[PDB]
Coordinates of C-alpha atoms and ligand atoms in Angstrom, one line a residue:
Chain A
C1 CA 20.8 14.9 4.7
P2 CA 19.9 14.1 1.1
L3 CA 18.9 10.5 1.6
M4 CA 16.8 9.1 4.5
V5 CA 15.0 5.8 4.9
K6 CA 12.0 5.2 7.2
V7 CA 10.6 1.6 7.7
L8 CA 7.3 0.8 9.5
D9 CA 5.9 -2.6 10.7
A10 CA 2.2 -2.9 9.6
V11 CA 1.6 -5.9 11.9
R12 CA 2.5 -4.2 15.2
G13 CA 1.8 -0.7 14.2
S14 CA 5.2 0.5 15.1
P15 CA 8.5 1.6 13.6
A16 CA 10.5 -1.2 12.3
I17 CA 13.6 -1.0 14.5
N18 CA 17.1 -2.4 13.6
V19 CA 16.3 -3.1 10.0
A20 CA 19.6 -3.3 8.1
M21 CA 20.0 -2.0 4.6
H22 CA 22.8 -1.6 2.0
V23 CA 22.9 1.1 -0.6
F24 CA 24.6 0.6 -4.0
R25 CA 25.4 2.9 -6.8
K26 CA 25.7 1.7 -10.4
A27 CA 29.3 2.1 -11.7
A28 CA 30.4 3.1 -15.2
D29 CA 30.9 -0.7 -16.0
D30 CA 27.3 -1.6 -15.1
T31 CA 28.1 -3.2 -11.8
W32 CA 26.6 -2.3 -8.3
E33 CA 29.2 -0.5 -6.3
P34 CA 28.6 -0.5 -2.4
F35 CA 27.7 3.1 -1.5
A36 CA 26.5 3.1 2.2
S37 CA 24.8 1.0 4.8
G38 CA 23.1 1.2 8.2
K39 CA 20.3 0.2 10.5
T40 CA 17.0 1.8 11.3
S41 CA 16.9 3.5 14.8
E42 CA 14.2 3.3 17.4
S43 CA 12.2 5.7 15.3
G44 CA 12.4 3.3 12.4
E45 CA 14.7 5.8 10.6
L46 CA 18.1 5.7 8.9
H47 CA 19.8 9.2 8.6
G48 CA 23.4 10.1 7.6
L49 CA 23.8 7.6 4.8
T50 CA 25.5 10.2 2.7
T51 CA 26.2 13.8 2.0
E52 CA 25.3 16.3 -0.7
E53 CA 28.9 16.1 -2.1
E54 CA 29.1 12.3 -2.2
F55 CA 25.5 11.8 -3.4
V56 CA 26.2 12.4 -7.1
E57 CA 23.9 11.8 -10.0
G58 CA 23.4 8.1 -10.8
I59 CA 21.2 5.1 -10.4
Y60 CA 21.0 3.8 -6.8
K61 CA 19.7 0.7 -5.2
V62 CA 18.6 0.4 -1.5
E63 CA 18.1 -3.2 -0.4
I64 CA 16.2 -3.4 2.8
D65 CA 16.8 -6.6 4.7
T66 CA 13.2 -7.3 5.6
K67 CA 13.5 -11.0 5.9
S68 CA 15.9 -10.9 8.9
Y69 CA 13.6 -8.5 10.5
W70 CA 10.5 -10.8 10.2
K71 CA 12.7 -13.8 11.1
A72 CA 13.8 -12.2 14.4
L73 CA 10.1 -11.7 15.2
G74 CA 9.4 -15.5 14.6
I75 CA 7.7 -15.0 11.2
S76 CA 8.7 -16.5 7.8
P77 CA 8.0 -13.8 5.3
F78 CA 7.5 -14.0 1.6
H79 CA 10.2 -11.6 0.3
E80 CA 14.0 -11.9 0.5
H81 CA 14.3 -8.2 0.9
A82 CA 12.7 -5.0 -0.4
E83 CA 14.6 -3.2 -3.0
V84 CA 14.2 0.5 -4.3
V85 CA 16.1 1.3 -7.5
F86 CA 16.0 4.8 -8.7
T87 CA 17.8 7.6 -10.6
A88 CA 18.9 10.3 -8.2
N89 CA 19.8 14.0 -8.8
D90 CA 19.5 13.8 -12.6
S91 CA 18.0 17.4 -12.7
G92 CA 20.2 18.7 -10.0
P93 CA 20.4 17.9 -6.2
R94 CA 17.2 16.7 -4.4
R95 CA 16.4 15.3 -0.9
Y96 CA 15.0 11.8 -1.0
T97 CA 12.9 10.2 1.7
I98 CA 12.3 6.5 1.0
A99 CA 9.5 5.0 3.2
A100 CA 8.8 1.2 3.3
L101 CA 5.8 -0.3 5.0
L102 CA 6.3 -4.0 5.8
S103 CA 4.0 -6.9 6.2
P104 CA 5.1 -10.5 6.1
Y105 CA 3.6 -11.1 2.6
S106 CA 3.4 -7.5 1.2
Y107 CA 5.3 -4.3 1.3
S108 CA 5.1 -0.9 -0.3
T109 CA 7.7 1.8 -0.8
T110 CA 7.1 5.5 -1.6
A111 CA 9.6 8.3 -2.2
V112 CA 9.1 11.9 -1.3
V113 CA 11.5 14.1 -3.2
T114 CA 11.8 17.7 -2.2
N115 CA 13.9 20.4 -3.8
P116 CA 16.5 21.6 -1.4
Chain B
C1 CA -0.2 -22.4 -13.3
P2 CA 2.3 -22.2 -10.5
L3 CA 3.4 -18.5 -10.8
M4 CA 1.2 -15.7 -12.0
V5 CA 1.8 -11.9 -11.9
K6 CA -0.9 -9.2 -11.8
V7 CA -0.1 -5.5 -12.1
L8 CA -2.5 -2.6 -11.5
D9 CA -2.5 1.1 -12.2
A10 CA -3.5 3.3 -9.2
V11 CA -3.4 6.5 -11.3
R12 CA -6.0 5.3 -13.7
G13 CA -7.9 2.5 -11.8
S14 CA -7.1 0.0 -14.5
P15 CA -5.0 -3.0 -15.2
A16 CA -1.5 -2.1 -16.1
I17 CA -1.5 -3.5 -19.7
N18 CA 1.6 -4.3 -21.7
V19 CA 3.9 -4.2 -18.8
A20 CA 7.2 -6.1 -19.5
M21 CA 8.9 -8.2 -16.8
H22 CA 11.7 -10.8 -16.6
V23 CA 11.9 -13.6 -14.1
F24 CA 15.3 -14.8 -12.9
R25 CA 16.4 -17.7 -10.7
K26 CA 19.4 -17.4 -8.4
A27 CA 22.2 -19.7 -9.8
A28 CA 24.8 -21.4 -7.4
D29 CA 27.5 -18.8 -8.3
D30 CA 25.1 -16.2 -6.8
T31 CA 24.3 -14.4 -10.1
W32 CA 20.8 -14.0 -11.6
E33 CA 20.0 -16.3 -14.5
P34 CA 17.1 -15.3 -16.8
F35 CA 14.3 -17.9 -16.4
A36 CA 11.0 -16.6 -18.0
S37 CA 9.6 -13.3 -19.3
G38 CA 6.5 -11.7 -20.7
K39 CA 4.1 -8.7 -20.9
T40 CA 0.8 -8.2 -19.1
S41 CA -2.3 -8.9 -21.0
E42 CA -5.3 -6.7 -21.1
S43 CA -6.5 -7.9 -17.8
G44 CA -3.1 -6.8 -16.4
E45 CA -2.0 -10.5 -15.9
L46 CA 0.9 -12.6 -17.0
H47 CA 0.4 -16.4 -17.0
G48 CA 2.3 -19.3 -18.5
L49 CA 5.6 -18.2 -16.9
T50 CA 6.7 -21.6 -15.9
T51 CA 5.3 -25.1 -15.1
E52 CA 5.4 -27.1 -11.9
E53 CA 8.2 -29.5 -13.0
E54 CA 10.5 -26.6 -13.9
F55 CA 9.5 -24.4 -11.0
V56 CA 11.7 -25.9 -8.3
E57 CA 12.8 -24.5 -5.0
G58 CA 15.2 -21.5 -5.1
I59 CA 15.4 -17.8 -5.0
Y60 CA 13.5 -16.0 -7.7
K61 CA 13.4 -12.3 -8.8
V62 CA 10.6 -10.8 -10.9
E63 CA 11.7 -7.5 -12.3
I64 CA 8.9 -5.4 -13.5
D65 CA 9.7 -2.7 -16.0
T66 CA 7.5 -0.1 -14.3
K67 CA 9.6 2.8 -15.7
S68 CA 8.7 2.0 -19.4
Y69 CA 5.0 1.8 -18.5
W70 CA 5.0 5.3 -16.8
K71 CA 7.0 6.7 -19.8
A72 CA 4.4 5.5 -22.4
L73 CA 1.7 7.2 -20.3
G74 CA 3.8 10.3 -20.1
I75 CA 4.2 10.5 -16.4
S76 CA 7.6 10.9 -14.6
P77 CA 8.2 7.9 -12.4
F78 CA 10.5 7.5 -9.5
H79 CA 11.6 3.8 -9.6
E80 CA 13.8 2.3 -12.3
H81 CA 11.6 -1.0 -12.0
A82 CA 10.0 -3.0 -9.3
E83 CA 11.7 -6.1 -8.1
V84 CA 10.1 -8.9 -6.2
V85 CA 12.7 -11.3 -4.7
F86 CA 11.5 -14.4 -2.9
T87 CA 12.3 -18.0 -2.0
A88 CA 10.0 -20.4 -3.7
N89 CA 8.5 -23.6 -2.4
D90 CA 10.1 -23.5 1.0
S91 CA 8.5 -27.0 1.6
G92 CA 6.8 -28.1 -1.6
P93 CA 4.9 -26.5 -4.6
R94 CA 2.2 -24.0 -3.7
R95 CA 0.7 -21.6 -6.4
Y96 CA 2.0 -18.0 -6.3
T97 CA 0.2 -14.9 -7.3
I98 CA 2.3 -11.7 -7.2
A99 CA 0.3 -8.6 -7.5
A100 CA 1.9 -5.2 -8.0
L101 CA 0.1 -1.9 -7.6
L102 CA 1.8 1.0 -9.4
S103 CA 1.9 4.7 -8.8
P104 CA 4.6 7.0 -10.3
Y105 CA 6.3 7.5 -6.9
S106 CA 5.1 4.4 -5.0
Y107 CA 4.4 0.8 -5.5
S108 CA 3.3 -2.2 -3.3
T109 CA 3.6 -5.8 -4.0
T110 CA 1.8 -8.7 -2.4
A111 CA 2.0 -12.4 -2.6
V112 CA -1.0 -14.7 -2.4
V113 CA 0.3 -18.2 -1.7
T114 CA -2.3 -21.0 -2.0
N115 CA -2.7 -24.7 -2.0
Chain C
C1 CA -21.4 -8.4 -12.4
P2 CA -21.1 -4.6 -11.9
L3 CA -19.5 -4.5 -8.4
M4 CA -17.1 -7.0 -7.0
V5 CA -15.0 -6.9 -3.8
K6 CA -11.7 -8.8 -3.2
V7 CA -9.9 -8.9 0.1
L8 CA -6.4 -10.1 0.8
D9 CA -4.4 -11.0 3.9
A10 CA -0.9 -9.5 4.0
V11 CA 0.0 -11.3 7.2
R12 CA -0.6 -14.8 5.8
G13 CA -0.3 -14.3 1.9
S14 CA -3.8 -15.6 1.4
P15 CA -7.3 -14.5 0.5
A16 CA -9.2 -13.1 3.4
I17 CA -11.9 -15.7 3.7
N18 CA -15.2 -15.2 5.4
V19 CA -14.9 -11.4 5.7
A20 CA -18.3 -9.7 6.2
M21 CA -19.2 -6.4 4.6
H22 CA -22.2 -4.2 4.0
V23 CA -22.8 -1.9 1.0
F24 CA -24.8 1.3 1.5
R25 CA -26.1 3.8 -0.8
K26 CA -26.3 7.5 0.1
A27 CA -30.1 8.5 0.4
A28 CA -31.3 12.1 -0.4
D29 CA -31.6 12.9 3.3
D30 CA -27.8 12.3 3.5
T31 CA -28.0 9.1 5.6
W32 CA -26.7 5.7 4.6
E33 CA -29.2 3.2 3.5
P34 CA -28.2 -0.5 3.5
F35 CA -28.1 -1.8 -0.1
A36 CA -26.3 -5.2 -0.3
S37 CA -24.1 -7.4 1.9
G38 CA -22.1 -10.7 2.0
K39 CA -19.0 -12.6 3.2
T40 CA -15.9 -13.3 1.0
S41 CA -15.7 -16.7 -0.5
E42 CA -12.6 -19.0 -0.3
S43 CA -11.0 -17.0 -3.1
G44 CA -11.5 -13.9 -0.9
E45 CA -14.1 -12.5 -3.4
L46 CA -17.6 -11.3 -3.0
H47 CA -19.7 -11.3 -6.2
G48 CA -23.5 -11.0 -6.8
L49 CA -23.8 -7.8 -4.8
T50 CA -26.0 -6.0 -7.2
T51 CA -27.1 -6.0 -10.9
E52 CA -26.7 -3.3 -13.5
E53 CA -30.3 -2.1 -13.4
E54 CA -30.3 -1.6 -9.7
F55 CA -26.8 -0.1 -9.6
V56 CA -27.5 3.4 -10.6
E57 CA -25.4 6.5 -10.1
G58 CA -24.9 7.7 -6.5
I59 CA -22.5 7.5 -3.6
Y60 CA -21.8 4.1 -2.2
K61 CA -20.0 3.0 0.9
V62 CA -18.6 -0.6 1.4
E63 CA -17.8 -1.2 5.0
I64 CA -15.6 -4.2 5.5
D65 CA -15.6 -5.8 8.9
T66 CA -11.8 -6.1 9.1
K67 CA -11.8 -6.1 12.9
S68 CA -13.9 -9.4 13.2
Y69 CA -11.5 -11.0 10.8
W70 CA -8.4 -10.1 12.8
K71 CA -10.1 -11.2 16.0
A72 CA -10.9 -14.7 14.6
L73 CA -7.2 -15.0 13.8
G74 CA -6.2 -13.8 17.2
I75 CA -4.4 -10.7 16.2
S76 CA -5.0 -7.2 17.6
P77 CA -6.1 -4.9 14.8
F78 CA -6.1 -1.1 14.8
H79 CA -9.1 -0.2 12.6
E80 CA -12.7 -0.8 13.5
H81 CA -13.5 -1.6 9.8
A82 CA -12.3 -0.4 6.4
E83 CA -14.6 1.9 4.5
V84 CA -14.6 2.5 0.8
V85 CA -16.8 5.5 -0.2
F86 CA -17.1 6.4 -3.9
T87 CA -19.3 7.9 -6.5
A88 CA -20.5 5.3 -8.9
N89 CA -21.1 5.7 -12.6
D90 CA -20.1 9.3 -13.0
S91 CA -21.1 9.0 -16.6
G92 CA -22.6 5.6 -17.3
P93 CA -22.1 2.0 -16.0
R94 CA -18.5 0.6 -15.8
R95 CA -17.6 -2.6 -13.8
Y96 CA -16.0 -1.9 -10.4
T97 CA -13.6 -4.1 -8.6
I98 CA -12.7 -3.0 -5.1
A99 CA -9.6 -4.8 -3.7
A100 CA -8.6 -4.4 -0.1
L101 CA -5.3 -5.6 1.3
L102 CA -5.4 -6.1 5.1
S103 CA -2.7 -5.8 7.8
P104 CA -3.5 -5.5 11.5
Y105 CA -2.3 -1.8 11.5
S106 CA -2.7 -1.0 7.9
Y107 CA -4.9 -1.4 4.9
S108 CA -5.0 -0.2 1.2
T109 CA -7.9 -0.2 -1.1
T110 CA -7.8 0.2 -4.8
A111 CA -10.5 0.4 -7.5
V112 CA -10.2 -1.1 -10.9
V113 CA -12.8 0.5 -13.2
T114 CA -13.2 -1.2 -16.5
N115 CA -15.4 -1.1 -19.6
Chain D
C1 CA 0.6 15.6 20.7
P2 CA -1.4 12.4 21.0
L3 CA -2.9 12.4 17.5
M4 CA -1.0 13.4 14.3
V5 CA -1.9 12.8 10.6
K6 CA 0.6 12.7 7.7
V7 CA -0.7 12.6 4.1
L8 CA 1.5 11.9 1.0
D9 CA 0.8 12.2 -2.7
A10 CA 2.0 9.0 -4.5
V11 CA 1.7 10.7 -8.0
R12 CA 4.0 13.6 -7.4
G13 CA 6.1 12.1 -4.7
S14 CA 5.5 14.9 -2.3
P15 CA 3.7 15.7 0.8
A16 CA 0.0 16.2 0.2
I17 CA -0.4 19.9 1.3
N18 CA -3.7 21.6 2.4
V19 CA -5.6 18.4 2.7
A20 CA -8.6 19.0 5.0
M21 CA -9.9 16.5 7.5
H22 CA -12.5 16.3 10.2
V23 CA -12.3 14.1 13.3
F24 CA -15.4 12.7 15.0
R25 CA -15.8 10.8 18.2
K26 CA -18.6 8.4 18.7
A27 CA -21.1 9.6 21.4
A28 CA -23.0 7.6 24.1
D29 CA -26.0 7.6 21.8
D30 CA -24.1 6.0 18.8
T31 CA -23.9 9.3 16.8
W32 CA -20.6 10.9 15.5
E33 CA -19.8 14.0 17.5
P34 CA -17.4 16.6 15.8
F35 CA -14.1 16.4 17.7
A36 CA -11.5 18.4 15.7
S37 CA -10.5 19.5 12.2
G38 CA -7.7 21.0 10.3
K39 CA -5.5 21.0 7.2
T40 CA -2.2 19.4 6.4
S41 CA 0.8 21.8 6.3
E42 CA 3.6 22.1 3.8
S43 CA 5.1 19.0 5.3
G44 CA 1.9 17.1 4.7
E45 CA 1.3 17.0 8.4
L46 CA -1.5 18.0 10.8
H47 CA -0.4 18.5 14.5
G48 CA -2.4 19.9 17.4
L49 CA -5.7 18.2 16.7
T50 CA -6.1 17.5 20.4
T51 CA -4.5 17.2 23.8
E52 CA -3.9 14.3 26.2
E53 CA -6.7 15.5 28.5
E54 CA -9.4 15.9 25.7
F55 CA -8.3 12.7 23.9
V56 CA -10.3 10.3 26.0
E57 CA -11.0 6.7 25.4
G58 CA -13.5 6.0 22.6
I59 CA -14.0 5.2 18.9
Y60 CA -12.8 8.0 16.6
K61 CA -13.2 8.6 12.9
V62 CA -10.8 10.7 10.8
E63 CA -12.3 11.6 7.4
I64 CA -9.6 12.9 5.0
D65 CA -11.0 14.9 2.2
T66 CA -9.0 13.3 -0.5
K67 CA -11.4 14.2 -3.3
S68 CA -11.0 18.0 -3.1
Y69 CA -7.3 17.5 -3.1
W70 CA -7.2 15.4 -6.3
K71 CA -9.9 17.8 -7.8
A72 CA -7.7 20.9 -7.2
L73 CA -5.0 19.1 -9.1
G74 CA -7.3 18.5 -12.1
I75 CA -7.9 14.8 -11.3
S76 CA -11.2 13.0 -10.8
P77 CA -10.4 10.4 -8.2
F78 CA -12.3 7.2 -7.2
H79 CA -12.9 7.8 -3.5
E80 CA -15.1 10.4 -1.8
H81 CA -12.6 10.6 1.0
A82 CA -10.4 8.3 3.0
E83 CA -11.7 7.3 6.5
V84 CA -9.8 5.8 9.5
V85 CA -12.1 4.5 12.3
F86 CA -10.4 3.2 15.4
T87 CA -10.7 2.7 19.1
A88 CA -8.2 4.9 20.9
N89 CA -6.7 4.8 24.4
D90 CA -8.7 1.7 25.5
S91 CA -5.6 0.3 27.5
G92 CA -4.6 3.8 28.7
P93 CA -3.1 6.8 26.8
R94 CA -1.2 6.3 23.5
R95 CA 0.3 8.5 20.7
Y96 CA -1.3 7.8 17.3
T97 CA 0.4 8.7 14.0
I98 CA -2.0 8.1 11.1
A99 CA -0.4 8.1 7.7
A100 CA -2.3 8.1 4.4
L101 CA -0.7 7.6 1.0
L102 CA -2.9 8.9 -1.8
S103 CA -3.3 7.9 -5.4
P104 CA -6.3 8.8 -7.5
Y105 CA -7.7 5.2 -7.5
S106 CA -6.0 3.8 -4.4
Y107 CA -5.0 4.8 -0.9
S108 CA -3.5 3.1 2.1
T109 CA -3.5 4.2 5.7
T110 CA -1.3 2.9 8.5
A111 CA -1.2 3.7 12.2
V112 CA 1.9 3.9 14.4
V113 CA 0.9 3.7 18.0
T114 CA 3.6 4.4 20.6
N115 CA 3.4 4.2 24.3
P116 CA 4.0 7.6 25.9
Ligands
LIG1 C1 -3.8 -3.7 -5.5 O1 -5.2 -4.0 -5.3 C2 -5.5 -5.1 -6.0 C3 -6.4 -5.1 -7.0 O2 -6.9 -3.9 -7.4 C4 -6.7 -6.3 -7.7 C5 -6.1 -7.5 -7.3 O3 -6.4 -8.6 -8.0 C6 -6.0 -9.9 -7.5 C7 -6.5 -11.1 -8.1 C8 -6.0 -12.3 -7.7 C9 -5.1 -12.4 -6.6 C10 -4.7 -11.2 -6.0 O4 -3.8 -11.2 -5.0 C11 -5.1 -9.9 -6.5 C12 -4.7 -8.8 -5.9 O5 -3.7 -8.8 -5.1 C13 -5.2 -7.5 -6.2 C14 -4.9 -6.3 -5.5 C15 -4.0 -6.2 -4.5 C16 -2.6 -6.0 -5.0 C17 -1.7 -4.9 -4.3 C18 -2.2 -4.0 -3.2 C19 -0.3 -4.8 -4.8 C20 -5.2 -13.5 -5.8 C21 -6.2 -14.3 -6.0 C22 -6.4 -14.7 -7.4 C23 -7.8 -15.4 -7.5 C24 -5.3 -15.6 -7.8 O6 -6.4 -13.5 -8.2
LIG2 C1 3.5 6.2 2.8 O1 4.9 6.3 2.8 C2 5.3 7.1 3.9 C3 6.1 8.2 3.7 O2 6.5 8.4 2.5 C4 6.4 9.0 4.8 C5 5.9 8.6 6.1 O3 6.2 9.4 7.2 C6 6.0 9.0 8.5 C7 6.6 9.7 9.6 C8 6.3 9.2 10.9 C9 5.5 8.1 11.1 C10 5.0 7.5 10.0 O4 4.2 6.4 10.2 C11 5.2 7.9 8.7 C12 4.6 7.2 7.6 O5 3.7 6.4 7.7 C13 5.1 7.5 6.3 C14 4.8 6.7 5.1 C15 4.0 5.5 5.1 C16 2.5 5.9 5.0 C17 1.6 4.9 4.3 C18 2.2 3.7 3.6 C19 0.1 5.1 4.2 C20 5.6 7.4 12.3 C21 6.4 7.9 13.3 C22 6.7 9.3 13.3 C23 8.1 9.4 14.1 C24 5.7 10.1 14.1 O6 6.9 9.9 12.0

């Protein structure tokens, strides 16, 4: 599992459950090609987006639909979504853990990249 | 000043100086039209992006070239850039301050929306 | 102004106004002696804490009463307070800006150290 | 495992390994009593600080020795340490995950509190 995403709610102190996200990969012609998508589980995690074979070198974008999440909780947040854009696997294969911590007017995102 | 951006450097405890960014507005065909751009000053701020007449409701994206900034300092960054995408003015003009705090493998962005 | 504190509210996208804090300095018997205190203004800043003569090298703690702030807004917070503990002036006076960003179950604090 | 701490380095994009921390509990007489201590593992985690029996209701403080960590990496950081002070178990037993994300001049800390 070379790409995993973990989302936390900073207002309730819990995993952010059922957060949708779409992953794109930049194609040869400079457009974003749809790569994978899913929702966070009850542990605030999304596993199985991809595999070591399919997760080739390139520039990827993960767009976390944070606004629907806040909206379903009765909150109007600032952001339309949270986006993480990064070059992956450029020095060979890595495992990427992307973590997003959400507040209605703020978010942060961090990557842990481990050599496996 | 209806839209201000402030960037900070969590590795050095300083403003992030000379950081380039573009601002786009969502156009009705759903693409991103360039709107305003600049570099951060020595206080890590970028002002004068727009005015209140021109800054109408809509979806705006600020794309901060964080990767060039880490490269000039000689430190491998993770992100290509930091994006902030938001709906402005939901019901009327407020002032927006967007602050980004940068680390090579992490960033946070916050909005302060005042009256 | 050698030491300034700024607090922000990530739930509401505003300054955190009226937030109380005390500043302590580490005394040679290793206890924490009160040094300065205040509340944030309407811009979420607290200035005038000390002056450059009085603000000598040493270990300082800023203890931000974040729990009272969340209680007045009616939202259960996790932390008792936020603490920022740092060695000042390692080699000479610099200006310090300590910014705290508050959420009920999270906070971040950053220092901007300038010349 | 009612209390777990996870520390990440935001400069290298990795777990923060071998970070020491001490946990105190506030005693009846308003002093901090030593409660537990340990170091983060290779996954940046510290498990086994306590047990459900010993982890009674009270105000706890976790002091993460972030400065030694930065120092061992050749960096002079701002903070002496990162401290998390909180009331635990006041509405009955909970599981607390405390996460700290470290940069030399900044850190954040978040708690996830789950009912078990
Ligand atoms: C990241 O920590 C900081 C920080 O170190 C400095 C900051 O400075 C600010 C100045 C500011 C405003 C700000 O929001 C900030 C900050 O956000 C700020 C922050 C917090 C920014 C982040 C945690 C990404 C609003 C009020 C106004 C008077 C318009 O000017
Ligand atoms: C800071 O960014 C991260 C991060 O990169 C990894 C994180 O890992 C976590 C794992 C975790 C839990 C977590 O809260 C985290 C993280 O917080 C985490 C974070 C966010 C940490 C901060 C923004 C300080 C909760 C549930 C449980 C199932 C026990 O496992």
